[PDB]
Amino acid sequence: LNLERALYRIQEKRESPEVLLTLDILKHGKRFHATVSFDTDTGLKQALETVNDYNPLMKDFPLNDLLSATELDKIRQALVAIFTHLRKIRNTKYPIQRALRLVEAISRDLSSQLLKVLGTRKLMHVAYEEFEKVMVAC
Amino acid sequence: DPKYADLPGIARNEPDVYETSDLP
Amino acid sequence: IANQPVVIDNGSGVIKAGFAGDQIPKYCFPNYVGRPKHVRVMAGALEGDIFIGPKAEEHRGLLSIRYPMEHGIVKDWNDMERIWQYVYSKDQLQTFSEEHPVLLTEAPLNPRKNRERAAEVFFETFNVPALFISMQAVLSLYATGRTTGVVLDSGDGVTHAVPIYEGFAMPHSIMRIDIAGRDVSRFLRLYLRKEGYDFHSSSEFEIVKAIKERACYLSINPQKDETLETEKAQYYLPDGSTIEIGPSRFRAPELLFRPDLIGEESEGIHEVLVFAIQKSDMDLRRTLFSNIVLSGGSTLFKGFGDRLLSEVKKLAPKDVKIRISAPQERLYSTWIGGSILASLDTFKKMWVSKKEYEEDGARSIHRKTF
Amino acid sequence: IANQPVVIDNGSGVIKAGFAGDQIPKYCFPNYVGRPKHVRVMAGALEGDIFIGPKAEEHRGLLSIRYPMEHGIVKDWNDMERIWQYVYSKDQLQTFSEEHPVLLTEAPLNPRKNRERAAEVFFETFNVPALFISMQAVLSLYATGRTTGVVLDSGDGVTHAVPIYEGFAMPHSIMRIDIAGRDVSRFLRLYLRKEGYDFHSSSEFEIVKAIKERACYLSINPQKDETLETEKAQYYLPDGSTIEIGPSRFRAPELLFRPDLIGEESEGIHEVLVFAIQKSDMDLRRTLFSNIVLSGGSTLFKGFGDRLLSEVKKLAPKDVKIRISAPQERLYSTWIGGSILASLDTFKKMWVSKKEYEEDGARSIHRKTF
Ligand SMILES: Nc1ncnc2c1ncn2[C@@H]1O[C@H](COP(=O)(O)OP(=O)(O)O)[C@@H](O)[C@H]1O
Ligand SMILES: Nc1ncnc2c1ncn2[C@@H]1O[C@H](COP(=O)(O)OP(=O)(O)O)[C@@H](O)[C@H]1O
């Protein structure tokens, strides 16, 4: 999100016709070194459209549900909601290995929320039905 | 122009752009 | 080491070099492979036995100037050994083969063999860190700022038209010819014998080229000015000897438009470029009429492009606005274009690492050259 | 959703796009599917490598232009996806599928498979909540205000009269046919070869289409005007290259009425309309005689409907008053009529709730698209 926001801000800075006008004077001076390198050699536009490609996947993701729920039903349906949000794949073109290890890190974040919700009963000594019901729902 | 002076094999008095007499 | 890369403004007749980012190459010199033809009698005589630079530019009365780049195409790799051997002089470099990346250039429609053997040289004998070699037309377009444009580039035994739209892979449409000023100057030596000037040395040929760039122009009327009485411009040697010219100064470049005058079937620069136009598309053709990149020092003549404008006007149909772009530095446009391209960060993939060629071969780079 | 409902102008040849309430389809463009025919070895060229919009509508021969709607029946799907991504482009939409109600139009008797693909797109890739897929002639009835009428569409490879009466489901009576000016223009490329014009590109075909849409018409007298000889007026290429038009301008569209010129047995869809008339009833036939609609871009020709008038006059019996209605905005009639229907409250029941519809499979709206 910070990347997209910075893309917007600095792209307005980029598209500031004053600096572009300085570049007009520079190209009029034919010093195409800096001008052409600033245009071509800067892969900023590529980064812009790349984050614009990931833009819907980087938008309204239901991850806070795992951060704000201690119910296996809520968490499980939150998993489903998250999963559905993760269908923006081919329409975003994210790196396979980065996607794998990304969702892998997400699974670790999930396990962290699982330990968070887990640390509340200790049904090994307290009631066995807690063990039964909670274990099954888990 | 300064680079045009810096190197020897550079001639002048000829416009770098040659176009047709585009009759309007 | 990947420091400021050495931008080498090559060339059939004038092969020089400089760096990236800079706007003036510090090593400006042509193509010339000379060596003394006499016996050192008195000791203390200046030597080196392979004279290039001020030696050659000083001791012209003793050297046998050789040329591997026949029509730009190298024919003598040993002469290339000596060429770079002189290039590799620190007074000519102030570096090593590895102290800077190298940026060498090419001409379109050339065999692999050239790149192969050269890669062997600069990555085995010499040991260049990073280097890529390609057409000078692209670099010229860099200097023009244009991307879509027919690069009319001419060497000195080379004359060619390179149609380009944003640097696309169009080798069928892209043309190339290898015939120019070397041969024209040789034909001027033929003029000399017809005039009575008994000359047959390469050093004399240098002077003919000095006239070519100096006391030789163009006209626009072939037959008309041929019928028109000349003035016989008396050239003067370094000695100062009277050398009349006549209309031969512009008569010899008629062969560039009339290739059969030397007995060589072709169609002239104009028609060959028109053939390149034919391979393009009507809409893109109009752009290329407006996008004409004349380049090469050989193209420096009085109304050169203006005559050619009239030629293509007689060739191209009506309501066709032809526009030429031809800077005064139709040499360094390639050098500055390489100075910019070599100054890029994406250029990593564009260059070729030393070890890469040292791993498998130049065919990988031949994949990279297209 | 409480936003402006998108009206997909899924034109066969020219697939435009727009919304409801508006009277102008947002963006108009054909089935062109371009990809460059070269390689941008030079850095500084243009990106994309797939071109929809002025990128392709400005450079054609450079790009491998494609067209998958095999007589409307699209075969590409990935390209369609990208086209719809381009539908949400910056100039184009900058919106979401979820953010807008979308309405699709279709030709009758299309394969369910295409609708399945569309469901996959707008329910997996895109996520339109209010997505409905409809017919195309009903739209024309909305624009004309009529309810009863013979709607003749005119695509690039799809033309068929749609005899409607107050939206009554008459699939047996109503006739669908997929053929139009595509192969007529290609047949004109056959004429080009028979007249010495070496053209094989779709871009060249588009130039011929510019002639088709521009310098072509329907001569009401078939052989009375065909057996004669025209002066073959001259057409000018993008370069301005003079090319004669010829009798072809009216000779080639006769194939629309004389399908055996290509060899395919058919009637000349006006006779298929007569078959629809036969399927209808005597006095109701008279209503449809008085009610004929001409939509689609390919309707635009001189004496087009007038020649067809003469045809039916040679077909329909005596005291048969027939009336046609050809709105100036043929393709837009469908678009504006889609805007009309998309601007309806009853129309909310036409589609099915997105997620449940996905769970409902496709047969539900397949049964509800009638
Ligand atoms: N005024 C001139 N008239 C004719 N020829 C020239 C002139 N100036 C330079 N040349 C020739 O043009 C050639 C330079 O153009 P360039 O593209 O650098 O070609 P090259 O490949 O020969 O170096 C030189 O070799 C030189 O002999
Ligand atoms: N002035 C014109 N004359 C003839 N045909 C035209 C004209 N303008 C557009 N067209 C035709 O419209 C067709 C485009 O197909 P289109 O009408 O978009 O399909 P659909 O009828 O399904 O919308 C092409 O045949 C094109 O030739």
Coordinates of N, CA and C in Angstrom, one line a residue, chain C residues 213-304:
Chain C
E213 N 37.2 15.4 -48.4 CA 36.5 16.1 -47.4 C 36.7 17.6 -47.5
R214 N 37.8 18.0 -48.2 CA 38.1 19.4 -48.4 C 37.7 20.0 -49.7
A215 N 38.4 19.7 -50.8 CA 38.1 20.3 -52.1 C 37.2 19.4 -52.9
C216 N 36.1 18.9 -52.4 CA 35.2 18.1 -53.2 C 33.7 18.3 -52.7
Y217 N 32.8 18.7 -53.6 CA 31.5 19.0 -53.2 C 30.5 18.2 -54.0
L218 N 29.2 18.6 -53.9 CA 28.1 18.0 -54.7 C 27.3 19.2 -55.3
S219 N 26.6 18.8 -56.3 CA 25.7 19.6 -57.1 C 24.4 18.9 -57.1
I220 N 23.4 19.3 -57.9 CA 22.2 18.5 -57.9 C 21.9 18.1 -59.3
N221 N 22.4 18.8 -60.2 CA 22.2 18.6 -61.7 C 23.3 17.7 -62.2
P222 N 23.0 16.4 -62.6 CA 24.1 15.6 -63.1 C 24.6 15.9 -64.5
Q223 N 23.7 15.7 -65.5 CA 23.9 15.9 -66.9 C 24.0 17.4 -67.2
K224 N 23.2 18.2 -66.5 CA 23.2 19.6 -66.8 C 24.6 20.2 -66.4
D225 N 25.0 20.0 -65.2 CA 26.3 20.5 -64.8 C 27.5 19.8 -65.5
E226 N 27.2 18.6 -66.0 CA 28.2 17.9 -66.8 C 28.4 18.6 -68.1
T227 N 27.3 19.1 -68.7 CA 27.4 19.9 -69.9 C 27.9 21.3 -69.6
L228 N 27.7 21.8 -68.3 CA 28.1 23.1 -67.9 C 29.6 23.1 -67.8
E229 N 30.2 24.2 -68.3 CA 31.7 24.3 -68.2 C 32.1 24.6 -66.8
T230 N 33.1 23.8 -66.3 CA 33.7 23.9 -65.0 C 34.7 25.1 -64.9
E231 N 35.3 25.1 -63.7 CA 36.3 26.1 -63.5 C 37.7 25.5 -63.2
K232 N 37.7 24.2 -62.9 CA 38.9 23.4 -62.6 C 39.7 24.0 -61.4
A233 N 39.0 23.8 -60.2 CA 39.5 24.2 -59.0 C 40.9 23.7 -58.7
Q234 N 41.9 24.6 -58.7 CA 43.2 24.2 -58.5 C 43.5 23.9 -57.1
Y235 N 43.7 22.7 -56.7 CA 44.1 22.3 -55.4 C 45.6 22.5 -55.2
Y236 N 46.0 22.8 -54.0 CA 47.4 22.9 -53.7 C 47.8 21.9 -52.7
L237 N 48.8 21.2 -53.0 CA 49.4 20.2 -52.1 C 50.0 20.8 -50.8
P238 N 50.5 20.0 -49.9 CA 51.3 20.6 -48.8 C 52.5 21.2 -49.4
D239 N 53.0 20.7 -50.5 CA 54.0 21.3 -51.3 C 53.5 22.6 -51.9
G240 N 52.2 22.5 -52.3 CA 51.5 23.7 -52.9 C 51.4 23.5 -54.4
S241 N 51.5 22.3 -55.0 CA 51.4 22.1 -56.4 C 49.9 22.3 -56.8
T242 N 49.8 23.0 -58.0 CA 48.5 23.2 -58.6 C 47.8 22.0 -59.0
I243 N 46.6 21.7 -58.5 CA 45.9 20.5 -58.8 C 44.5 20.9 -59.2
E244 N 44.2 21.0 -60.5 CA 42.9 21.3 -61.0 C 41.9 20.1 -60.7
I245 N 40.7 20.4 -60.6 CA 39.6 19.5 -60.2 C 38.6 19.3 -61.4
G246 N 37.9 20.4 -61.7 CA 36.9 20.4 -62.7 C 35.6 20.0 -62.0
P247 N 34.8 19.3 -62.7 CA 33.5 18.8 -62.2 C 33.6 17.4 -61.6
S248 N 34.8 16.9 -61.6 CA 35.1 15.6 -61.0 C 34.8 15.5 -59.5
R249 N 34.8 16.6 -58.8 CA 34.5 16.6 -57.4 C 33.1 16.2 -57.1
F250 N 32.2 16.5 -58.0 CA 30.8 16.0 -57.8 C 30.5 14.9 -58.8
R251 N 31.4 14.7 -59.8 CA 31.2 13.7 -60.8 C 31.4 12.3 -60.1
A252 N 32.4 12.2 -59.3 CA 32.7 10.9 -58.6 C 31.6 10.5 -57.7
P253 N 30.9 11.4 -56.9 CA 29.8 10.9 -56.1 C 28.5 10.6 -56.9
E254 N 28.5 10.8 -58.2 CA 27.4 10.4 -59.0 C 27.3 8.9 -59.0
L255 N 28.5 8.2 -58.9 CA 28.6 6.8 -58.8 C 27.9 6.3 -57.6
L256 N 27.8 7.1 -56.5 CA 27.1 6.7 -55.4 C 25.6 6.6 -55.6
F257 N 25.2 7.3 -56.7 CA 23.8 7.2 -57.1 C 23.7 6.4 -58.4
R258 N 24.9 6.3 -59.1 CA 25.0 5.5 -60.3 C 26.1 4.5 -60.2
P259 N 25.8 3.4 -59.4 CA 26.8 2.4 -59.1 C 27.5 1.7 -60.3
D260 N 26.9 1.7 -61.5 CA 27.5 1.1 -62.6 C 28.6 1.9 -63.2
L261 N 28.9 3.1 -62.7 CA 30.0 3.8 -63.3 C 31.3 3.1 -62.9
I262 N 31.3 2.4 -61.8 CA 32.5 1.6 -61.4 C 32.3 0.2 -61.9
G263 N 31.2 -0.1 -62.5 CA 30.9 -1.5 -62.9 C 30.5 -2.3 -61.7
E264 N 29.4 -1.9 -61.1 CA 28.9 -2.6 -60.0 C 27.4 -2.5 -60.0
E265 N 26.7 -3.5 -60.2 CA 25.2 -3.4 -60.2 C 24.7 -3.2 -58.8
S266 N 23.8 -2.2 -58.7 CA 23.2 -1.8 -57.5 C 22.1 -0.8 -58.0
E267 N 21.5 0.0 -57.1 CA 20.5 0.9 -57.5 C 20.7 2.3 -56.9
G268 N 21.8 2.6 -56.3 CA 21.9 3.9 -55.8 C 21.2 4.0 -54.4
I269 N 21.9 4.7 -53.5 CA 21.5 5.0 -52.1 C 20.0 5.2 -52.0
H270 N 19.5 6.1 -52.8 CA 18.1 6.6 -52.9 C 17.2 5.4 -53.2
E271 N 17.4 4.7 -54.3 CA 16.5 3.6 -54.6 C 16.6 2.4 -53.6
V272 N 17.8 2.2 -53.1 CA 18.0 1.1 -52.1 C 17.2 1.5 -50.8
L273 N 17.2 2.8 -50.5 CA 16.4 3.2 -49.3 C 14.9 3.1 -49.7
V274 N 14.6 3.4 -50.9 CA 13.2 3.2 -51.4 C 12.8 1.8 -51.3
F275 N 13.7 0.9 -51.5 CA 13.4 -0.6 -51.4 C 13.1 -0.9 -49.9
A276 N 13.9 -0.2 -49.0 CA 13.7 -0.4 -47.6 C 12.3 0.2 -47.2
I277 N 11.9 1.2 -47.9 CA 10.6 1.8 -47.7 C 9.5 0.9 -48.1
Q278 N 9.7 0.2 -49.3 CA 8.8 -0.8 -49.8 C 8.5 -1.9 -48.9
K279 N 9.5 -2.3 -48.1 CA 9.3 -3.3 -47.1 C 8.6 -2.9 -45.9
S280 N 8.4 -1.5 -45.7 CA 7.7 -1.0 -44.6 C 6.3 -0.8 -45.0
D281 N 5.5 -0.1 -44.3 CA 4.1 0.1 -44.6 C 3.7 1.5 -44.8
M282 N 2.8 1.8 -45.8 CA 2.4 3.1 -46.2 C 2.2 4.2 -45.1
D283 N 1.6 3.8 -44.0 CA 1.4 4.7 -42.9 C 2.8 5.0 -42.3
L284 N 3.6 4.0 -42.0 CA 4.9 4.1 -41.4 C 5.8 4.7 -42.4
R285 N 5.6 4.6 -43.7 CA 6.4 5.2 -44.7 C 6.4 6.7 -44.6
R286 N 5.3 7.3 -44.4 CA 5.2 8.8 -44.3 C 6.0 9.3 -43.1
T287 N 6.0 8.5 -42.0 CA 6.8 8.8 -40.9 C 8.2 8.8 -41.3
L288 N 8.7 7.7 -41.9 CA 10.0 7.6 -42.4 C 10.4 8.6 -43.4
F289 N 9.4 9.2 -44.2 CA 9.8 10.3 -45.1 C 10.1 11.5 -44.2
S290 N 9.4 11.6 -43.1 CA 9.7 12.7 -42.2 C 10.9 12.2 -41.3
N291 N 11.1 10.9 -41.1 CA 12.1 10.4 -40.3 C 13.3 9.9 -41.1
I292 N 14.1 10.8 -41.6 CA 15.3 10.4 -42.4 C 16.5 10.7 -41.6
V293 N 17.3 9.7 -41.2 CA 18.5 10.0 -40.4 C 19.7 9.8 -41.3
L294 N 20.2 10.9 -41.9 CA 21.4 10.8 -42.7 C 22.5 10.8 -41.8
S295 N 23.5 10.0 -42.0 CA 24.6 9.9 -41.1 C 25.8 9.4 -41.9
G296 N 27.0 9.6 -41.3 CA 28.2 9.2 -41.9 C 28.9 10.4 -42.4
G297 N 30.2 10.5 -42.3 CA 31.0 11.6 -42.7 C 31.0 11.7 -44.2
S298 N 30.9 10.5 -44.9 CA 30.9 10.4 -46.3 C 29.7 11.2 -46.9
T299 N 28.7 11.4 -46.2 CA 27.5 12.2 -46.6 C 27.7 13.7 -46.5
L300 N 28.9 14.1 -46.2 CA 29.1 15.6 -46.1 C 29.5 16.2 -47.4
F301 N 28.5 16.8 -48.1 CA 28.7 17.4 -49.4 C 27.7 18.5 -49.5
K302 N 28.0 19.4 -50.5 CA 27.2 20.6 -50.8 C 25.9 20.2 -51.4
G303 N 24.8 20.3 -50.6 CA 23.5 19.9 -51.2 C 23.4 18.4 -51.3
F304 N 24.1 17.7 -50.5 CA 24.2 16.2 -50.5 C 22.7 15.7 -50.3

